[PDB]
Amino acid sequence: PEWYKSAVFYELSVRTFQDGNGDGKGDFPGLTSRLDYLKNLGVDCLWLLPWFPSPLRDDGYDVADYRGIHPDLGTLDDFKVFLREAHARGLWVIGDLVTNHTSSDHPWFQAARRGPTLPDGSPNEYHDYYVWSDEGKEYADTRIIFTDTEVSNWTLDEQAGKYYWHRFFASQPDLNYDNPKVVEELHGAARFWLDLGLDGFRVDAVPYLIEREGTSCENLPETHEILKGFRAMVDREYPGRLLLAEARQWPEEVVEYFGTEAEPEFHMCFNFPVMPRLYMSLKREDTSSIREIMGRLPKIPSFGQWCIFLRNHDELTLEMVTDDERAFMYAAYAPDARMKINVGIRRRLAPLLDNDRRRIELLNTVLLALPGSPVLYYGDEIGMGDDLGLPDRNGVRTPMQWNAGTSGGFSTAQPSDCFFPPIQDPVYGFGRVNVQSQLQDPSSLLKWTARQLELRRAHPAFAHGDLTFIETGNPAILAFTRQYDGETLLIVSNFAGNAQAGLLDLAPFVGRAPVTLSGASPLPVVTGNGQYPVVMGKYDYYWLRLNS
Amino acid sequence: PEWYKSAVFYELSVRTFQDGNGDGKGDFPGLTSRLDYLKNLGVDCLWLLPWFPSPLRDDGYDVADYRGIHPDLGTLDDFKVFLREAHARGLWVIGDLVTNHTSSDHPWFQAARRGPTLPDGSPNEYHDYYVWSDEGKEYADTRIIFTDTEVSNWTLDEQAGKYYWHRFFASQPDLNYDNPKVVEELHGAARFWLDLGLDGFRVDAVPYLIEREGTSCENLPETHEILKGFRAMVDREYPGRLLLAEARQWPEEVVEYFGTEAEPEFHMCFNFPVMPRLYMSLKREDTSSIREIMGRLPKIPSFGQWCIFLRNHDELTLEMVTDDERAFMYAAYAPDARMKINVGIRRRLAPLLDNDRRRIELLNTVLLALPGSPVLYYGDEIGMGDDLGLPDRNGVRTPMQWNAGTSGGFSTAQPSDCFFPPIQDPVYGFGRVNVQSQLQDPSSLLKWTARQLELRRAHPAFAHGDLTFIETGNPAILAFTRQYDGETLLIVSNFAGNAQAGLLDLAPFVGRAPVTLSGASPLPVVTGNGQYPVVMGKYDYYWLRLNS
Ligand SMILES: [Ca+2]
Ligand SMILES: [Ca+2]
Ligand SMILES: [Mg+2]
Ligand SMILES: [Mg+2]
């Protein structure tokens, strides 16, 4: 069983996790000091957000050199030391491979915008690196992903006197995947890092690579043909290593990015479609939305493994839901206008659940109990909040809060001089929410989280089991099984804020004794026709074993 | 129905609650400015600890003047407006009344220790206020309560040249209750406050009033008669007021202190024995002991009511349990030797339960669902902690933590200057635990507690209903019913730290559906033989109503 199947991932922005030189910006020297924390929390893989040189207009997803380390974060040596030390400790590391586009400041585009043919008469290698147009009329019927900023997907470079394509920001010019030179250019970039010992990538914005006139330009098969090339490259050149796709898409298109047994594609994809239904079912006290969405997920290849997440560095995306659901979400979870952005809500996990421990522990159990490898977003293990006064998605990207000293331990510089200012308010401020406190608090959320991860660690049916929903007779109770290697788990959870009664249909399991995973307290043995009755308190989760 | 029966009491010390002027001592003006806080919290009566002028040898139970107020706290006027402002907001306030003895600094005793007659020949009215002996030998066959500091119960005064009787500290001389002038004083002290519109008294040290040769000098009939005299007086002149006995004796020893229908005495007494038991049941995962001790409660007069609590200004008293019981408690709740004192444990509530919100709620619900007027202790609504770095039981008498400003909002004095220092530790310190945070946090403990007091208030069966334990078939689960006026309450509670299953014997209520007091979500109806199977999560509490 491959390593990425049993792994727990944890996502972080180097620039915001821990600064080590008082300049007010996170860095690899500082990240390297903290590796002990992550490891003993129960994290196996780190996934760092982009670390490359870049004018930082989409926080360094606008890459200006693929083989660099942004000055801010340290040097290539620091990076190597970081890597060596993660590895020393049993930690895997992966990064973000930004494939669909670069910054407008990349030397490549600086050459491209000269003209189609060089002033000395000769032709320009770099102009057919990008995607140009004269009138800029192609690919209408194409959505504008950054709706609150971009009015079109073609913009007008003056130096070139033509239009260029960008699904994202104007300064993030899209890369021409019809030019096979460009495919070799990125093959280089991935070799570069993989040679250093990096254990994989999360690859970014992958549906949008190839663009055909008369289609939406998402999930095209040519796109997939390209990706197939990369996984081919890795399957040959670097056995073991991981490829992980971000695809914000409906469930039938999302599965496509695993490929087939015969034509393998990605090792992992994020389960984007389950994550909103989690929040929705919460507010509706109705888990149906969850059952439907999981029931629309085909078997994936032997090698595939789902990637499960609650939140991340981005807005809670609501693009891939019906209009009716979208509006309902906004009213229930985004009452103020500055809580919205693009087609999504820009908030951290805890503020979304109104800082309610009970609801928080609940939705983390379901993150753990589903089929996949879970990824934690940094700071949510201690219950960090947001600063909605920061532009774009910066309010969920504040500094990690280590203790109650200056800037919460992230830096010796005053908050004002940090790159993003650490939360100081009475509820979510570092005064009250920080790691050092919760390493001393016996009942803290951090201890709770460490202690539950460990519990999942001791049962592999979580990581590797099959799944099968149960009948509860009550939409607020959601039950399912996980079997793997002789182990049958029964996970029941109550999405209602008050007590709820179910009748569980355990017909398949007649004669078996249920017991608690924690302490094996015995429950009555299934009998009769196997209709097991239950009552459940507000937001309870029962994690169970069935013994034959 | 008499106000004291429905009410929720709240115990604070003025000296430690809020400081108006920055002297570093709480006082009435400061207290006055926090009355909205208390109104909104949900409580009905303020029990104040001793505010009388005193040298403070025995924490102000050593009184220098029963008709004044200690100067640290304010003036008689400050008190009158505090009282006018409490009342204006529907709060009753009661005070501490120390009947058996005064301080050696009381004028009475200073004037008493001259001699049986004056330097002008004439006799000395105040010689007979206290209790004198020539050889000091009477009243062997009586114990020395404070076995630690005191040797004798007679102490030699050189100025009077005689011995005086004192049950307590030698600076707390017994009043001479066989002298009728003194009974007059006791009545006049009580009348002073009752005129100001004080609503009642906690009456202190009653068993030891009268002392007789040849007895225990405890619980004597003569002493009961004075209290009847006392009760009689208040019924005549100030009807509606409350007299509550402080007195730590088993419930069947204490019933007497209510008196009888014909000859009233005290309106309320404390029930001590359940208190330790709730704690023990939790950690033994077994509730027999609670059932058993409510089972053994005597009948009490119509006007009677029991008082009932969790923690307070003193140590968790383990006098009222078996030795084997006392060991379990010390083993489970007092790992550190220095958490022990005086057959008790000197820790606040959240620390006792490892700051575990679930356990903390668990226990408060039961306190509030059980018969008896509950008294809550300042600071436990926000989960304050303790300072064992302070002597005696001053660990649990730290200043209230209002916000995260200087001295946690209590004073403008720096922490070192405050009367006792506010707690600053990582877990329970005012940077992390305070009112300002908890009001701003939609899911705080403080808000929860108000929710719950609201919930109690809506169902009179909690104040006036009878009590009937049911079966469950599993010790960790504790179920009972409250009934008054047609309404029937069913409150089920889980004392185990993991899921548990029960079979509730609801035979008396077949054909009836239980429903949630919170959002009125209903459950399966009761059917057949009336055995109603349940499941409960760790430390759950189910507050239910039964409809016909
Ligand atoms: Ca593209
Ligand atoms: Ca006496
Ligand atoms: Mg730095
Ligand atoms: Mg003062």
Side-chain angles (χ1 to χ4, degrees):
Chain A
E2 298 91 307
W3 66 265
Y4 57 65
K5 294 195 196 181
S6 325
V8 184
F9 302 61
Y10 182 104
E11 178 194 344
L12 62 93
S13 172
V14 190
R15 197 177 267 86
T16 236
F17 193 68
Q18 178 66 76
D19 168 29
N21 78 285
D23 66 326
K25 320 170 212 204
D27 59 53
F28 281 103
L31 170 47
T32 311
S33 37
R34 299 288 187 196
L35 295 155
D36 275 334
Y37 164 72
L38 294 177
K39 183 58 211 148
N40 304 314
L41 178 54
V43 157
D44 307 293
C45 188
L46 313 188
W47 147 30
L48 287 33
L49 265 49
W51 54 62
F52 313 90
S54 149
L56 300 185
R57 295 187 218 85
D58 188 6
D59 219 40
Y61 278 99
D62 67 324
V63 192
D65 168 8
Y66 281 99
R67 301 152 129 94
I69 293 281
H70 196 310
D72 284 10
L73 306 185
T75 67
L76 197 91
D77 298 279
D78 290 306
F79 176 76
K80 277 187 220 185
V81 178
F82 154 61
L83 205 33
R84 181 230 302 160
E85 289 291 315
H87 282 145
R89 289 179 185 72
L91 291 163
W92 282 262
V93 175
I94 68 175
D96 251 294
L97 196 58
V98 178
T99 43
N100 183 76
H101 57 288
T102 70
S103 175
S104 42
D105 281 317
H106 202 308
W108 291 357
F109 186 89
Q110 288 302 309
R113 62 201 293 272
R114 287 169 91 186
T117 47
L118 278 254
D120 76 310
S122 43
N124 190 348
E125 156 160 348
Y126 297 115
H127 193 90
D128 291 323
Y129 269 53
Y130 294 78
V131 169
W132 300 90
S133 174
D134 319 286
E135 299 283 2
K137 341 214 73 161
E138 305 80 318
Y139 321 113
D141 223 74
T142 223
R143 68 194 177 90
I144 277 56
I145 303 179
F146 286 155
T147 56
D148 298 345
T149 333
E150 290 304 333
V151 314
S152 148
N153 288 150
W154 289 105
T155 319
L156 190 44
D157 175 298
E158 312 174 330
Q159 193 107 111
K162 292 201 268 176
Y163 288 114
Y164 70 94
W165 182 247
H166 59 78
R167 295 308 314 265
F168 301 102
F169 279 128
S171 71
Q172 290 179 290
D174 249 45
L175 277 184
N176 161 23
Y177 275 87
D178 284 326
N179 184 346
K181 213 320 179 223
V182 167
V183 187
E184 249 300 300
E185 277 290 15
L186 255 82
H187 274 65
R191 283 199 197 79
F192 177 73
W193 299 105
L194 285 166
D195 287 332
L196 299 159
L198 185 63
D199 307 286
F201 298 87
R202 184 204 92 143
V203 186
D204 161 87
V206 297
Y208 307 88
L209 296 187
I210 299 287
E211 24 266 7
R212 294 281 166 270
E213 179 60 87
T215 68
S216 62
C217 317
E218 310 171 30
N219 311 295
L220 302 166
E222 302 72 350
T223 299
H224 285 271
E225 203 66 8
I226 284 156
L227 299 167
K228 283 146 142 39
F230 271 116
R231 169 60 171 287
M233 189 256 271
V234 167
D235 265 25
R236 193 179 43 257
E237 295 196 16
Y238 310 83
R241 317 299 226 282
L242 166 66
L243 296 171
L244 170 62
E246 178 207 47
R248 294 130 300 171
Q249 288 305 321
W250 296 87
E252 40 271 344
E253 295 101 42
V254 168
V255 163
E256 285 168 354
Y257 296 91
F258 286 103
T260 101
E261 303 288 1
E263 313 212 357
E265 193 165 345
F266 272 104
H267 290 84
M268 301 182 76
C269 322
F270 287 116
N271 193 338
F272 265 95
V274 76
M275 165 275 295
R277 281 92 192 175
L278 297 174
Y279 297 84
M280 209 177 80
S281 298
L282 218 28
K283 221 86 171 161
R284 297 229 48 175
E285 308 203 338
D286 192 279
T287 62
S288 315
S289 63
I290 301 153
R291 286 219 280 181
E292 290 158 6
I293 210 88
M294 300 297 282
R296 293 173 58 181
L297 290 167
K299 351 81 195 290
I300 49 170
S302 58
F303 56 80
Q305 172 67 315
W306 281 106
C307 197
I308 316 285
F309 80 108
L310 300 170
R311 294 289 296 105
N312 62 42
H313 69 284
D314 265 305
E315 72 258 269
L316 187 169
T317 173
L318 300 164
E319 176 73 79
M320 297 285 154
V321 277
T322 79
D323 298 56
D324 284 338
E325 293 170 318
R326 185 175 307 104
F328 173 90
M329 285 300 295
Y330 280 151
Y333 285 104
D336 186 8
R338 73 187 185 170
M339 301 185 183
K340 293 158 216 156
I341 192 176
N342 307 317
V343 182
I345 294 176
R346 47 161 166 198
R347 293 178 87 196
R348 276 227 173 201
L349 182 59
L352 281 165
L353 311 177
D354 296 304
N355 219 20
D356 180 10
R357 186 60 178 266
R358 283 203 152 78
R359 281 190 236 141
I360 289 157
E361 291 178 5
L362 177 73
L363 278 198
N364 282 285
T365 81
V366 177
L367 171 79
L368 303 173
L370 289 179
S373 306
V375 38
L376 303 193
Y377 183 58
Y378 80 92
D380 288 2
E381 70 275 25
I382 53 168
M384 279 185 71
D386 47 45
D387 177 11
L388 269 11
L390 307 168
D392 204 329
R393 294 142 292 158
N394 297 1
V396 300
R397 289 180 194 184
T398 40
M400 183 54 175
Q401 300 162 187
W402 287 107
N403 56 72
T406 316
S407 311
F410 162 73
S411 186
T412 68
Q414 310 299 147
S416 337
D417 308 85
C418 291
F419 190 73
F420 298 142
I423 289 160
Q424 301 212 227
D425 80 62
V427 175
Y428 303 105
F430 58 76
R432 171 166 196 245
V433 186
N434 62 97
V435 168
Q436 203 49 253
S437 278
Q438 297 196 35
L439 291 172
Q440 274 130 80
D441 176 357
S443 272
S444 83
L445 181 64
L446 178 80
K447 295 208 165 159
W448 178 84
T449 297
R451 195 210 95 263
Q452 205 81 22
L453 271 184
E454 204 170 279
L455 197 60
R456 189 208 202 251
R457 201 147 58 83
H459 300 273
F462 280 122
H464 312 299
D466 77 311
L467 179 68
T468 316
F469 289 115
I470 295 308
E471 225 71 333
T472 68
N474 174 341
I477 303 182
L478 167 85
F480 50 93
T481 50
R482 323 283 317 284
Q483 296 149 124
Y484 181 79
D485 200 338
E487 186 185 38
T488 299
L489 299 190
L490 184 48
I491 309 311
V492 188
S493 323
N494 183 11
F495 279 64
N498 50 115
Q500 285 300 328
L503 195 73
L504 263 50
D505 174 34
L506 307 183
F509 307 106
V510 167
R512 300 221 206 180
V515 317
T516 57
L517 289 190
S518 188
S521 144
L523 272 60
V525 178
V526 191
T527 58
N529 56 343
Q531 298 308 278
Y532 211 75
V534 297
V535 194
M536 296 182 76
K538 58 170 201 285
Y539 301 125
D540 277 342
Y541 38 85
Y542 301 164
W543 277 23
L544 306 176
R545 189 164 70 245
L546 290 185
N547 301 328
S548 41
Chain B
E2 297 109 306
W3 66 276
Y4 60 78
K5 290 185 186 164
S6 307
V8 187
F9 290 94
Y10 184 90
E11 153 188 6
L12 76 270
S13 176
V14 184
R15 192 178 316 269
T16 228
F17 193 75
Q18 176 67 62
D19 169 29
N21 66 316
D23 61 350
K25 296 162 201 188
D27 51 62
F28 281 94
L31 171 55
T32 289
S33 60
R34 300 287 195 192
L35 288 177
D36 282 350
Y37 175 79
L38 297 169
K39 178 49 180 155
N40 284 324
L41 184 62
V43 296
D44 301 306
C45 179
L46 274 31
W47 159 21
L48 277 60
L49 274 346
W51 60 67
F52 305 129
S54 171
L56 297 189
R57 297 196 202 94
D58 195 345
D59 302 310
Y61 295 90
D62 60 314
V63 36
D65 166 6
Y66 296 93
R67 304 138 103 108
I69 78 175
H70 197 289
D72 281 4
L73 284 41
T75 70
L76 205 253
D77 257 291
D78 294 325
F79 170 92
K80 296 201 200 176
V81 4
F82 144 81
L83 225 191
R84 185 247 289 153
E85 293 297 343
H87 276 161
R89 290 173 183 73
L91 296 152
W92 289 261
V93 8
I94 73 169
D96 250 286
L97 189 62
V98 186
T99 39
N100 178 53
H101 53 272
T102 84
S103 182
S104 35
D105 289 345
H106 204 297
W108 296 355
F109 181 88
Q110 287 297 296
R113 73 202 284 283
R114 294 171 191 177
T117 68
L118 276 335
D120 81 319
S122 66
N124 183 39
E125 159 172 21
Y126 299 97
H127 180 80
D128 283 353
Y129 280 31
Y130 296 84
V131 168
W132 303 99
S133 191
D134 323 318
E135 273 281 26
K137 295 295 191 195
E138 300 93 302
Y139 310 150
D141 270 305
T142 96
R143 57 192 191 79
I144 290 86
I145 300 159
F146 295 176
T147 339
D148 203 350
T149 331
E150 294 311 318
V151 191
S152 160
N153 274 2
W154 296 104
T155 298
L156 198 267
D157 197 317
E158 178 61 46
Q159 170 89 162
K162 303 210 275 207
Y163 291 90
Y164 56 85
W165 180 246
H166 61 87
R167 298 311 307 269
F168 293 114
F169 221 85
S171 62
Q172 291 182 296
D174 280 41
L175 285 165
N176 176 27
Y177 272 91
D178 283 320
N179 186 334
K181 226 307 170 211
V182 174
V183 178
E184 276 169 41
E185 298 287 17
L186 174 53
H187 284 43
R191 260 201 229 78
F192 186 69
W193 301 104
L194 289 168
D195 282 349
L196 278 30
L198 195 58
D199 295 294
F201 295 105
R202 192 177 90 122
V203 184
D204 304 75
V206 304
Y208 313 93
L209 293 190
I210 300 294
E211 21 267 348
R212 279 286 169 277
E213 196 67 60
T215 77
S216 51
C217 301
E218 283 162 349
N219 302 298
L220 266 33
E222 292 81 2
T223 60
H224 277 271
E225 187 55 11
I226 296 148
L227 297 166
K228 304 190 150 56
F230 200 47
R231 172 54 176 278
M233 181 261 284
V234 311
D235 281 1
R236 192 177 327 110
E237 299 166 57
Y238 314 84
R241 312 304 163 93
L242 166 62
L243 300 186
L244 185 209
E246 170 231 55
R248 201 216 297 185
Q249 341 190 131
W250 296 92
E252 43 280 2
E253 292 169 350
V254 174
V255 283
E256 302 148 342
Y257 288 86
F258 286 95
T260 74
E261 299 293 341
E263 317 202 2
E265 198 169 341
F266 271 116
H267 295 84
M268 295 171 66
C269 299
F270 278 97
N271 193 342
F272 268 90
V274 313
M275 177 264 299
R277 269 101 195 160
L278 307 145
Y279 288 105
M280 199 178 94
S281 300
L282 198 49
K283 216 104 178 162
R284 207 222 154 98
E285 301 187 305
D286 186 328
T287 68
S288 335
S289 68
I290 295 161
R291 290 189 63 147
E292 201 222 16
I293 201 66
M294 297 307 206
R296 299 210 209 293
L297 274 184
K299 293 147 178 299
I300 62 168
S302 50
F303 58 76
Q305 167 76 292
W306 295 104
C307 201
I308 254 293
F309 67 112
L310 278 171
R311 286 298 296 119
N312 67 10
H313 69 287
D314 283 313
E315 78 270 33
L316 201 184
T317 142
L318 300 170
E319 266 188 5
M320 302 216 209
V321 291
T322 77
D323 291 38
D324 281 324
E325 286 167 345
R326 187 178 308 107
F328 186 80
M329 285 291 311
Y330 287 151
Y333 287 112
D336 193 358
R338 207 43 261 174
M339 301 161 181
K340 285 161 191 185
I341 191 172
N342 303 323
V343 206
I345 297 180
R346 61 173 194 174
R347 319 177 56 186
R348 275 222 175 217
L349 176 51
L352 284 162
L353 315 162
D354 264 294
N355 202 7
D356 180 22
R357 185 90 179 246
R358 284 206 163 75
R359 291 196 211 100
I360 294 170
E361 301 181 7
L362 197 257
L363 282 199
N364 287 280
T365 85
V366 182
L367 179 70
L368 302 185
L370 278 165
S373 291
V375 37
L376 290 46
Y377 181 60
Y378 84 102
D380 291 358
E381 328 103 62
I382 55 169
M384 282 186 43
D386 65 46
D387 181 343
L388 262 48
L390 303 176
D392 235 78
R393 301 138 296 158
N394 297 330
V396 299
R397 302 187 185 177
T398 29
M400 186 63 171
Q401 324 204 148
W402 291 104
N403 53 56
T406 175
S407 274
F410 172 62
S411 188
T412 65
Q414 302 287 355
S416 340
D417 297 319
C418 293
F419 181 82
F420 297 132
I423 282 162
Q424 310 180 252
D425 81 278
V427 173
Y428 299 94
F430 64 76
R432 183 166 184 238
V433 177
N434 68 41
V435 173
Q436 184 171 80
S437 281
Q438 300 214 37
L439 300 165
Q440 272 173 48
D441 171 332
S443 321
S444 76
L445 185 49
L446 170 69
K447 287 199 171 168
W448 174 80
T449 295
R451 191 85 198 282
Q452 212 72 19
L453 288 165
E454 197 175 328
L455 213 53
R456 192 196 204 250
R457 214 185 293 102
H459 297 86
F462 285 124
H464 313 125
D466 78 323
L467 170 71
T468 337
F469 291 112
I470 88 182
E471 197 66 3
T472 99
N474 166 12
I477 292 176
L478 174 77
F480 50 95
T481 44
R482 305 301 299 285
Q483 281 143 133
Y484 166 91
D485 215 298
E487 193 170 62
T488 306
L489 258 32
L490 171 66
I491 106 93
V492 201
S493 308
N494 180 15
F495 279 78
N498 69 351
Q500 297 291 310
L503 195 57
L504 273 48
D505 164 43
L506 297 183
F509 313 100
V510 186
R512 309 192 68 174
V515 345
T516 272
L517 274 42
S518 203
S521 194
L523 271 29
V525 342
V526 179
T527 48
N529 52 11
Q531 297 314 277
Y532 196 98
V534 295
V535 185
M536 327 176 70
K538 62 184 189 271
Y539 304 120
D540 266 335
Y541 49 92
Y542 296 161
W543 278 18
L544 304 173
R545 180 175 76 262
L546 297 185
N547 300 339
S548 43

